[PDB]
Amino acid sequence: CRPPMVKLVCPADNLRAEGLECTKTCQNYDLECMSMGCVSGCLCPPGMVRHENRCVALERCPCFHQGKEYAPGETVKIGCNTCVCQDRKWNCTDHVCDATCSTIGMAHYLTFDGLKYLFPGECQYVLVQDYCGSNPGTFRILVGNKGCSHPSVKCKKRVTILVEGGEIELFDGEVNVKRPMKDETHFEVVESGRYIILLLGKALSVVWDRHLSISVVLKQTYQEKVCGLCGNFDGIQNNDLTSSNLQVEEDPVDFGNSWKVSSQCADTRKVPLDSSPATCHNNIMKQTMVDSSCRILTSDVFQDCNKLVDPEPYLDVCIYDTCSCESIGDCACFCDTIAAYAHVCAQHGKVVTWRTATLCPQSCEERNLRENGYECEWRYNSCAPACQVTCQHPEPLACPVQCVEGCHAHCPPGKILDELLQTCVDPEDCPVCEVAGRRFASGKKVTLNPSDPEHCQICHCDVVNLTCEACQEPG
Amino acid sequence: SSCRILTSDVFQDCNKLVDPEPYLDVCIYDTCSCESIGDCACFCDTIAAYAHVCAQHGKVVTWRTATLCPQSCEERNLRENGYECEWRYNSCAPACQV
Amino acid sequence: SGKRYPPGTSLSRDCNTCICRNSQWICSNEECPGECLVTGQSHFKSFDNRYFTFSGICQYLLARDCQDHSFSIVIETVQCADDRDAVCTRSVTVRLPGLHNSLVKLKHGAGVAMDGQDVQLPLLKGDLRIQHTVTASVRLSYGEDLQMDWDGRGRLLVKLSPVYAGKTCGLCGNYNGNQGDDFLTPSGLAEPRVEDFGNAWKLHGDCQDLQKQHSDPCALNPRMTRFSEEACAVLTSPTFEACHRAVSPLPYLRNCRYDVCSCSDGRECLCGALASYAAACAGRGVRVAWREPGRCELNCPKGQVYLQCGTPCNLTCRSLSYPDEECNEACLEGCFCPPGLYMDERGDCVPKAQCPCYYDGEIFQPEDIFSDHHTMCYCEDGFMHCTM
Amino acid sequence: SSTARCSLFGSDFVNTFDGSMYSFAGYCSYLLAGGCQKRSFSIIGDFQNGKRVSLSVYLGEFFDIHLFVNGTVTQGDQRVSMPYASKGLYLETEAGYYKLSGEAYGFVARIDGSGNFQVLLSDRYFNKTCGLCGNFNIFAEDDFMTQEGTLTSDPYDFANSWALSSGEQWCERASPPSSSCNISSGEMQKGLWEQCQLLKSTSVFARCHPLVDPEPFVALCEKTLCECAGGLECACPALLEYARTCAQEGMVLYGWTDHSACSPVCPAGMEYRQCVSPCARTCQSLHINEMCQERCVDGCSCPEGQLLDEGLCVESTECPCVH
Ligand SMILES: *[C@@H]1O[C@H](CO)[C@@H](O)[C@H](O)[C@H]1NC(C)=O
Ligand SMILES: *[C@@H]1O[C@H](CO)[C@@H](O)[C@H](O)[C@H]1NC(C)=O
Ligand SMILES: *[C@@H]1O[C@H](CO)[C@@H](O)[C@H](O)[C@H]1NC(C)=O
Ligand SMILES: *[C@@H]1O[C@H](CO)[C@@H](O)[C@H](O)[C@H]1NC(C)=O
Ligand SMILES: *[C@@H]1O[C@H](CO)[C@@H](O)[C@H](O)[C@H]1NC(C)=O
Ligand SMILES: [Ca+2]
Ligand SMILES: [Ca+2]
Ligand SMILES: [Ca+2]
């Protein structure tokens, strides 16, 4: 018909004629097409396939992803995986990235493999642990809430991190090292922004928003060696509700009760399912207002992230929480459930700015005013590099989260911040010490090379002093 | 308990001049009837009213902490090419200036 | 599931067995048959228990044997009411490359038509045995590694034996016991939106792509909201309290609400949505009694009576003509008639005396005598006990 | 402009936002107007058997009011008083006609004495509304868009695609009623033909013609005139509508009812004043001028004296005190 195009005629001696009825465009090419005759119009030459009103000479045609066309050879990044498509399909890499627990809001959980469930407990529970079956194991993070079955202005959760034989439990927005870690070189607490990122090993970390948002970041090493309220981190999402007695369960509450640490505590009683949890129940007006308010997760500033991350789980969490929660002066049970989604978006590279003066204000001027003069180096920033070099951590750190939210101090170059003095000061005016002439630490109070005493020229620092004690010989 | 902030440590001086009982009843009534989701304003406003009344009597009150009606002011500087940082929150600064 | 069990018991997850030893369950780990379900307005359940909704209007590729090509199941959807959120399946098409490359088509009237011609069921062709069901359905069955189900109103169950595990691609997913990767497109890349995943599987380029998948059709017809709510609250009522621990009722509740607010006739959709959950509970083992005179007591002709747990093996007259054939079928919720009465060809079941004989298709008469010069046969009471 | 005026006048008659008159005699609730992408509100008009029974407004899906032609007005499921002011909707008797205003949502509905409906949608809903009154675009030829999104040409299919069944309505496709006129015509028609032709012949009606074409109005009154049981008034509905639409176009025609011999029905005591002030003079009212200067609206009010007192004209001397 059209001169680049060409027509055909239906042979009256067949049934699988496969004419214009079964046109083969790009995405139709792989698919299998079943017809009931033919139309005998004009179809592209049998070496090329129609695509956006043309006939692409040799097929090799674009590679759709998220409703977008990608020319061949182009690569797209998903997690740790680069994906380039040749003929027509992407041959991604096989790296497995760091998994991540989460306490989304006040009663929901999000396992390692990705599974939102609801479990409103009030006892202590095993969030994730390694003493799991045949494995010897190391760490035993536990989470314990208080009065949380009706979460309004209560349920200040507390974590207890029993790693390396040292209790590092954290509560009231303050990490509290109950007992020292045996090998303290791993342990490193990095208070940044609004978060208290904890580095408890070379393949384990904890980031905590100082109120309720607890999430454990595990690396490739573990890979089906853990179990607890966050499932067993194997990539299979169906079996994440296996109770403590090796039996997969259908109800989340039975699972949660099975993962309780103190048997003589109170089981959570199953509640009949209801769309409106507690106060949204008969007050349908309130339920509609709550729905519309939580609809901000699908708003003009969140459009970019909605294509990468599904907002439905976080929408459900927002609705449930701010229905059950009664907010009077602290509108925190609402703003936290959106800050969690913003944090996830930022972890995927989609930084979003959503706080306005009439919507979760988040002041940061109380730190500047403390100085007798206002010097103004503290400022909010949707998401800024969290894990930065200060006088307390003069050396760089491998660190789980890219950027976080909160009052991040910006101040002129060459005047690196120190945490104790909220001011930022020149590098010299810090207790940083170079014992081996290298930029190590604040003169690390760490024992060096005991099992080879031939090199044990042990040397420390307290403030700037290049102090050097002895290595007490056994005999 | 929340509206009880009117008879609190920072408001002790004002109560010697202005009785918080009308404002306490207003706070309770509004907060009960109000449904607050994203703006806890039907509470912060009923307290800001009492703070204003106290201020007009000579008792300036600072009550507004980072976990209670924060009221940030960074948006009047960031719009500039460089963060000039000249605006700030003041509990009671003169109104009709030059 | 929140109840104690003395040591030594042996529970079953309807495919595997668990033994209680030392307060721990030792459970077998065998692969199990998978079920892809297309129900309601546009509700899907994948092979790995991934519930979703997708209201697209085109011909979609539901499930294809994807490394070898022993079958391929294609579905076709149309708007099913006045709204724009009510998109239901009309007809389903199956290709059998192992059988002449033939093309079976289950139609909207619960009929069936192989390669254009209509077909009178049963059909015991080479491999596939299409025949009707107690509830006037159509049960396709290819070999023994595949099954299927009627497509009159727009429901469909596909059952695949574990010989197909991990080797099928379609709207139903890989069938690899992992729910995560079910939004997989032909280009081998999971798309985190149901609209894109659905649109990636349409067979025709002229079909309109879906842009937004609405969650509350109730908001275009507010007049319905209240009814829908109460109409579906039964799913959480003590009436279904028995099987809340066998299959969670949340997806079926959302599907019930969507179906009631969206479809044209709410009365039909309410009982087409409760029956889905009842069948899901009956799958695992729990039999629920949920019909009430208000709540859609199914009614079949006056000769028949509703049986909750019947015996679809000996009701039909044809059965008496082939007693050697085996019926390894469970009880099926439908209607039957007393054991002194057997189903007649016309449809009014009669005592086994006047019950014809189906020797080589051709139907004979309750005392017909078909003699010959070398053989002789006579239809006595549903089988020609006939000499040579 | 800034407003548009759908109107379900007469019996079974409908006048869309853009002026596409047609006839439809439904059997369940229908969708008068409301946005079709984002549905903040939805005016719904109910029928019983051809004859309309009420008007309804469904704010979101949490609030609903049912203002019945029989004066009755239920909220939700319970009969309420009048005036009513909840949820940002103000429901009150203005100029003797029940009125339901939602200026926050930009809509004003009204019911007069005989039972006619009248919806004044705003201008923000331009090209956005989607209902039995057709989309609010200036074009008047594409106003029969069904709910499927496809334009039709038979008014009954267009109207039936917008039926909104409920838990206890369950309505069905409706069909045009059989005509009985075709046997009964003749002697009456000789004089009847004048009632419709005066719509365009009469001088008072003769200046609307540059604004609104009168052919469809005479057409509809002519086709509804035959089934009249020997009466002049059986054509005055159209005339009334012709006035009202012509008034809405910005040129109100004065004193057309002097010799029309048909007058609108109004409560006893009040006469149909063409362009009466919407600002009444109730006995207990503060004399605040320059704050009650809204646009004039046609309707009926008390005589020159006789200030209002709870919908009953009483002389200015007998205004009762209240305590
Ligand atoms: C994956 O990519 C590599 C490197 O380009 C190529 O050698 C290999 O054939 C690809 N394999 C598949 C399964 O596409
Ligand atoms: C946030 O901080 C980052 C890193 O310091 C900086 O690059 C960026 O300009 C900041 N953005 C805003 C909005 O202040
Ligand atoms: C507010 O303005 C006053 C008047 O200049 C000044 O004295 C004061 O320092 C400012 N802020 C506070 C906290 O008082
Ligand atoms: C109004 O109409 C309703 C519904 O038909 C009827 O129940 C009621 O009695 C009527 N009330 C009046 C005052 O006519
Ligand atoms: C109204 O919207 C339609 C559909 O987008 C568009 O085709 C048309 O041009 C618009 N008309 C006006 C007057 O804006
Ligand atoms: Ca798992
Ligand atoms: Ca899968
Ligand atoms: Ca139009």
Numbering used by the authors:
A (entry chain F): 767 to 1241
B (entry chain H): 1058 to 1155
C (entry chain E): 353 to 740
D (entry chain G): 30 to 352
Paper text:
The polypeptide including the propeptide and mature VWF chain (proVWF) subsequently forms “tail-to-tail” homodimers through their C-terminal cystine knot (CK) domains. These proVWF dimers are then transported to the Golgi where they assemble into large multimers ‘head-to-head’ through interchain disulfide bonds between D3 domains of two proVWF dimers. Therefore, the disulfide linkages and the cysteines involved in the VWF D′D3 dimer interface remain to be confirmed with the discrepancy mainly on Cys1097 and Cys1099. Here we identified the disulfide linkages from the D′D3 dimer interface through chemical digestion and mass spectrometry and solved the cryo-electron microscopy (cryo-EM) structure of VWF tubules with each repeating unit containing one D′D3 dimer and one D1D2 dimer.
The tubule-like oligomers of these complexes were analyzed by single-particle cryo-EM. Each repeating unit contains a D′D3 dimer and a D1D2 dimer. The connecting loop linking two helices in the D′D3 monomer restrained by the Cys1091–Cys1097 disulfide is anchored in a hydrophobic pocket formed by Phe1100, Met1055, and Val1056 through Ile1094, but in the dimer, it is more flexible with the intramolecular Cys1091–Cys1099 bond and flips over to dock in the same hydrophobic surface pocket of the other D′D3 molecule in a domain swapping-like fashion.
